[PDB]
């Protein structure tokens, strides 16, 4: 039932293509609308050799986990963690690796796919 506030459509790994690799590549400082960090996510689809990159804030990671935890029992989800706060890059990366190792129902659900779908910003 829940949509992702930042996402205009629902996408499925059918249309978008399955994930071979994901990581948090780096973090990036933003000034608009206010000063904040955003995470550059590296995605390699299957049958692809050149990766692509999307931008997601920490608050956008947590909306995904909160929305997943409406659909799925908590033990089906990896733990979510609660600037030199670049430990979030490391912790978000651990979260993504674990998410890919979840049951298929979780790791290939439409919420996860949609989270990785190129947005407004992600058009370089």
Coordinates of N, CA and C in Angstrom, one line a residue:
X1 N 0.8 -1.2 0.0 CA 0.0 0.0 0.0 C 0.8 1.3 0.0
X2 N 2.0 1.4 0.6 CA 2.7 2.7 0.7 C 3.6 2.9 -0.5
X3 N 3.9 4.2 -0.8 CA 4.2 4.6 -2.2 C 5.6 5.0 -2.4
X4 N 6.3 5.6 -1.4 CA 7.5 6.4 -1.5 C 7.1 7.8 -1.8
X5 N 7.4 8.7 -0.9 CA 7.0 10.1 -1.1 C 7.7 10.8 -2.2
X6 N 8.9 10.4 -2.5 CA 9.7 11.0 -3.5 C 9.6 10.3 -4.9
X7 N 8.6 9.4 -5.1 CA 8.6 8.6 -6.3 C 7.2 8.7 -7.0
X8 N 7.2 9.1 -8.3 CA 6.0 9.5 -8.9 C 5.2 8.3 -9.4
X9 N 5.8 7.2 -9.6 CA 5.3 5.9 -10.1 C 5.7 4.8 -9.3
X10 N 5.1 3.6 -9.5 CA 5.6 2.4 -8.9 C 6.3 1.6 -10.0
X11 N 7.5 1.2 -9.8 CA 8.3 0.4 -10.8 C 8.5 -1.0 -10.2
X12 N 8.7 -2.0 -11.0 CA 9.0 -3.4 -10.7 C 10.2 -3.8 -11.4
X13 N 10.9 -4.8 -10.7 CA 12.2 -5.3 -11.3 C 12.0 -5.9 -12.7
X14 N 10.8 -6.4 -12.9 CA 10.4 -6.7 -14.3 C 10.9 -5.6 -15.3
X15 N 10.3 -4.4 -15.2 CA 10.6 -3.3 -16.1 C 12.0 -2.8 -16.0
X16 N 12.5 -2.7 -14.8 CA 13.8 -1.9 -14.5 C 15.0 -2.8 -14.7
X17 N 14.9 -4.1 -14.4 CA 16.1 -4.9 -14.5 C 16.7 -5.2 -13.1
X18 N 17.1 -6.5 -12.9 CA 17.5 -6.9 -11.6 C 18.9 -6.4 -11.2
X19 N 19.2 -6.3 -9.9 CA 20.4 -5.8 -9.4 C 21.4 -6.8 -9.2
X20 N 22.6 -6.6 -9.9 CA 23.8 -7.4 -9.6 C 24.6 -6.9 -8.5
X21 N 24.7 -5.5 -8.4 CA 25.6 -4.9 -7.4 C 25.0 -3.6 -7.0
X22 N 25.0 -3.3 -5.7 CA 24.7 -2.0 -5.1 C 25.7 -1.6 -4.0
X23 N 26.0 -0.4 -3.9 CA 26.8 0.1 -2.8 C 26.5 1.6 -2.7
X24 N 26.9 2.2 -1.5 CA 27.0 3.6 -1.4 C 28.4 4.0 -1.8
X25 N 28.4 4.7 -3.0 CA 29.7 5.0 -3.6 C 30.4 6.2 -2.9
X26 N 29.7 7.2 -2.5 CA 30.2 8.4 -1.8 C 29.1 9.2 -1.3
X27 N 29.4 10.2 -0.6 CA 28.3 11.2 -0.1 C 28.7 12.5 -0.7
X28 N 27.7 13.4 -0.8 CA 27.9 14.7 -1.5 C 27.1 15.8 -0.7
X29 N 27.8 16.9 -0.5 CA 27.3 18.1 0.2 C 26.4 18.9 -0.7
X30 N 25.2 19.2 -0.2 CA 24.2 20.0 -0.9 C 23.9 21.3 -0.1
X31 N 23.5 22.3 -0.8 CA 23.2 23.6 -0.1 C 21.7 24.0 -0.3
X32 N 21.0 23.4 -1.2 CA 19.6 23.7 -1.5 C 18.6 22.6 -1.3
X33 N 17.5 22.8 -0.6 CA 17.0 24.0 0.0 C 17.8 24.5 1.2
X34 N 18.4 23.5 1.9 CA 19.2 23.8 3.0 C 20.5 22.9 2.9
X35 N 21.4 23.1 3.8 CA 22.7 22.4 3.8 C 22.5 21.0 4.3
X36 N 22.8 20.0 3.5 CA 22.6 18.6 3.9 C 23.5 17.7 3.0
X37 N 23.7 16.4 3.5 CA 24.4 15.4 2.7 C 23.5 14.5 2.0
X38 N 23.8 14.0 0.9 CA 23.1 13.1 0.1 C 24.0 12.0 -0.4
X39 N 23.5 10.7 -0.4 CA 24.3 9.6 -0.7 C 24.2 9.2 -2.2
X40 N 25.3 8.9 -2.8 CA 25.4 8.5 -4.2 C 25.5 7.0 -4.3
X41 N 24.4 6.4 -4.7 CA 24.2 5.0 -4.7 C 24.7 4.4 -6.1
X42 N 25.5 3.4 -6.1 CA 26.1 2.8 -7.3 C 25.2 1.5 -7.5
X43 N 24.6 1.5 -8.7 CA 23.8 0.3 -9.1 C 24.4 -0.3 -10.4
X44 N 24.6 -1.6 -10.3 CA 25.0 -2.3 -11.5 C 23.8 -3.3 -11.7
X45 N 23.0 -3.1 -12.8 CA 22.0 -4.1 -13.2 C 22.7 -5.3 -13.9
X46 N 22.0 -6.3 -14.0 CA 22.5 -7.5 -14.6 C 22.5 -7.4 -16.1
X47 N 23.5 -8.0 -16.8 CA 23.6 -7.7 -18.2 C 24.1 -6.2 -18.5
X48 N 24.6 -5.6 -17.4 CA 25.2 -4.3 -17.6 C 26.6 -4.3 -17.1
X49 N 27.5 -3.5 -17.7 CA 28.9 -3.4 -17.2 C 29.2 -2.0 -16.7
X50 N 28.5 -1.0 -17.2 CA 28.6 0.4 -16.8 C 27.6 0.6 -15.7
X51 N 28.0 1.0 -14.5 CA 27.0 1.3 -13.4 C 26.3 2.6 -13.7
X52 N 25.2 2.8 -12.9 CA 24.6 4.1 -12.9 C 24.5 4.5 -11.4
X53 N 24.1 5.7 -11.2 CA 24.2 6.3 -9.9 C 22.9 7.1 -9.6
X54 N 22.4 6.9 -8.4 CA 21.2 7.7 -8.0 C 21.6 8.4 -6.6
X55 N 20.8 9.4 -6.3 CA 21.1 10.3 -5.2 C 19.9 10.1 -4.2
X56 N 20.2 9.8 -2.9 CA 19.2 9.5 -1.9 C 19.7 10.0 -0.6
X57 N 18.8 10.8 0.1 CA 19.2 11.3 1.4 C 18.9 10.2 2.4
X58 N 19.5 10.4 3.6 CA 19.3 9.5 4.7 C 17.8 9.4 5.0
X59 N 17.1 10.5 5.0 CA 15.6 10.5 5.3 C 14.9 9.6 4.2
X60 N 15.5 9.5 3.0 CA 14.8 8.8 2.0 C 15.1 7.3 2.2
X61 N 16.3 7.0 2.7 CA 16.6 5.6 3.1 C 15.6 5.1 4.1
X62 N 15.3 6.0 5.1 CA 14.5 5.5 6.3 C 13.1 5.4 5.9
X63 N 12.6 6.2 5.0 CA 11.2 6.1 4.5 C 11.0 4.7 3.9
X64 N 12.1 4.2 3.2 CA 11.9 2.9 2.6 C 11.9 1.8 3.6
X65 N 12.7 1.9 4.6 CA 12.7 0.9 5.7 C 11.4 0.9 6.4
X66 N 10.9 2.2 6.8 CA 9.7 2.3 7.5 C 8.5 1.8 6.7
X67 N 8.5 2.0 5.4 CA 7.5 1.5 4.5 C 7.6 0.0 4.3
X68 N 8.8 -0.5 4.2 CA 8.9 -2.0 4.1 C 8.4 -2.6 5.4
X69 N 8.6 -2.0 6.6 CA 8.2 -2.6 7.8 C 6.7 -2.6 8.1
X70 N 6.0 -1.9 7.2 CA 4.5 -2.0 7.2 C 4.1 -3.3 6.5
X71 N 4.9 -3.7 5.4 CA 4.5 -4.8 4.6 C 5.1 -6.1 5.3
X72 N 6.3 -6.0 5.8 CA 7.0 -7.2 6.2 C 7.3 -7.3 7.7
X73 N 7.3 -8.5 8.2 CA 7.7 -8.6 9.6 C 9.2 -8.2 9.8
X74 N 9.5 -7.5 10.9 CA 10.8 -6.9 11.1 C 11.9 -7.9 10.9
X75 N 11.7 -9.2 11.3 CA 12.9 -10.1 11.2 C 13.2 -10.5 9.7
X76 N 12.3 -10.1 8.8 CA 12.6 -10.3 7.4 C 13.4 -9.1 6.8
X77 N 13.6 -8.1 7.6 CA 14.4 -6.9 7.2 C 15.7 -6.7 7.9
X78 N 16.7 -6.2 7.3 CA 18.0 -5.9 8.0 C 17.8 -4.8 9.0
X79 N 18.6 -4.7 10.0 CA 18.6 -3.6 10.9 C 18.9 -2.3 10.2
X80 N 18.1 -1.3 10.5 CA 18.4 0.0 10.1 C 19.1 0.8 11.2
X81 N 20.1 1.6 10.8 CA 20.9 2.3 11.8 C 20.1 3.6 12.2
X82 N 20.3 4.0 13.5 CA 19.6 5.3 13.9 C 20.4 6.5 13.6
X83 N 30.2 16.3 7.0 CA 30.1 15.9 8.4 C 30.9 14.7 8.6
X84 N 31.4 14.5 9.8 CA 32.0 13.3 10.2 C 31.0 12.2 10.3
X85 N 29.7 12.5 10.4 CA 28.6 11.6 10.2 C 28.6 11.0 8.8
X86 N 29.8 10.6 8.3 CA 30.0 9.8 7.1 C 30.0 8.3 7.5
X87 N 29.7 8.0 8.7 CA 29.5 6.6 9.1 C 28.2 6.2 8.5
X88 N 27.3 7.1 8.2 CA 26.1 6.8 7.5 C 26.3 6.2 6.2
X89 N 27.4 6.6 5.5 CA 27.7 6.0 4.2 C 28.1 4.5 4.4
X90 N 28.9 4.2 5.5 CA 29.2 2.8 5.7 C 28.0 2.0 6.2
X91 N 27.2 2.6 7.0 CA 26.1 1.9 7.6 C 25.0 1.7 6.5
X92 N 24.8 2.7 5.7 CA 23.8 2.6 4.6 C 24.3 1.5 3.6
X93 N 25.6 1.4 3.4 CA 26.1 0.4 2.5 C 25.9 -1.0 3.1
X94 N 26.1 -1.2 4.4 CA 25.8 -2.4 5.1 C 24.3 -2.8 4.9
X95 N 23.5 -1.8 5.1 CA 22.0 -2.0 5.0 C 21.7 -2.5 3.6
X96 N 22.2 -1.9 2.5 CA 21.9 -2.3 1.2 C 22.4 -3.8 0.9
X97 N 23.7 -4.1 1.3 CA 24.1 -5.5 1.1 C 23.2 -6.4 1.8
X98 N 22.8 -6.2 3.0 CA 21.9 -7.1 3.7 C 20.5 -7.1 3.0
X99 N 20.0 -6.0 2.5 CA 18.8 -6.0 1.8 C 18.8 -6.9 0.6
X100 N 19.9 -6.9 -0.2 CA 20.1 -7.8 -1.3 C 20.2 -9.3 -0.8
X101 N 20.5 -9.6 0.4 CA 20.6 -10.9 0.9 C 19.3 -11.4 1.6
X102 N 18.3 -10.5 1.6 CA 17.0 -10.8 2.2 C 16.3 -11.9 1.3
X103 N 15.2 -12.4 1.8 CA 14.4 -13.3 1.0 C 13.9 -12.5 -0.2
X104 N 13.6 -13.3 -1.3 CA 13.3 -12.7 -2.6 C 12.1 -11.8 -2.5
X105 N 11.1 -12.2 -1.8 CA 9.9 -11.4 -1.5 C 10.2 -10.0 -1.1
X106 N 11.3 -9.8 -0.3 CA 11.7 -8.5 0.2 C 12.7 -7.9 -0.8
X107 N 13.7 -8.6 -1.2 CA 14.8 -8.0 -2.0 C 14.3 -7.6 -3.4
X108 N 13.3 -8.2 -3.9 CA 12.8 -7.9 -5.2 C 11.3 -7.4 -5.2
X109 N 10.9 -6.7 -4.2 CA 9.6 -6.1 -4.1 C 9.6 -4.7 -4.8
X110 N 8.5 -4.3 -5.1 CA 8.3 -3.1 -5.9 C 8.8 -1.8 -5.2
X111 N 8.7 -1.8 -3.8 CA 9.3 -0.7 -3.1 C 10.8 -0.6 -3.3
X112 N 11.5 -1.7 -3.2 CA 12.9 -1.7 -3.3 C 13.3 -1.2 -4.7
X113 N 12.7 -1.9 -5.7 CA 12.9 -1.4 -7.1 C 12.7 0.1 -7.3
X114 N 11.6 0.5 -6.8 CA 11.2 1.9 -7.0 C 12.2 2.9 -6.3
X115 N 12.7 2.5 -5.1 CA 13.7 3.3 -4.5 C 15.0 3.4 -5.4
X116 N 15.3 2.4 -6.2 CA 16.4 2.5 -7.1 C 16.1 3.1 -8.4
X117 N 14.9 3.5 -8.7 CA 14.6 4.0 -10.0 C 15.0 5.5 -10.2
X118 N 15.7 5.8 -11.3 CA 16.2 7.1 -11.6 C 15.1 8.2 -11.5
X119 N 15.4 9.2 -10.6 CA 14.4 10.2 -10.4 C 14.8 11.5 -11.3
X120 N 14.0 12.6 -11.0 CA 14.4 13.9 -11.4 C 15.9 14.1 -11.3
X121 N 16.4 14.2 -10.0 CA 17.8 14.5 -9.7 C 18.7 13.6 -10.5
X122 N 18.4 12.3 -10.6 CA 19.4 11.3 -11.0 C 19.7 11.4 -12.5
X123 N 19.0 12.3 -13.2 CA 19.4 12.6 -14.6 C 20.5 13.5 -14.6
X124 N 21.7 12.9 -14.5 CA 23.0 13.5 -14.2 C 23.1 15.0 -13.8

